[PDB]
Amino acid sequence: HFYLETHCTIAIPKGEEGEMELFVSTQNAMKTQSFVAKMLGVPVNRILVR
């Protein structure tokens, strides 16, 4: 692909109820959200992808 900006993610753990806010260079915030929630083992509503 050689997108000038390579893959990048910033993950911010809130420390509450498994909440996490992520800033991601992605075209798929939905899958990023569900995949992160799946790995963490928390409901999808706890993960915010921006």
Nearer to a second copy, 2 or 10 (CB): 10
CA 38, 40, 46, 50 dihedral sign is negative
The DSSP element (H or E) to which 9 belongs, if any, is: strand 9-13
Q: CB under 8 Å to 14, separation ≥6 — which residues?
A: 20, 21
- Residue 20 lies near a second copy (rule: CB under 8 A): no
Q: Closest distance between a second copy and the C-beta of residue 38, in Å?
A: 6
Is 33 annotated as ligand-binding? no
Q: Closest distance between a second copy and the C-beta of residue 22, in Å?
A: 9
Annotated binding site for Mo-molybdopterin: 27
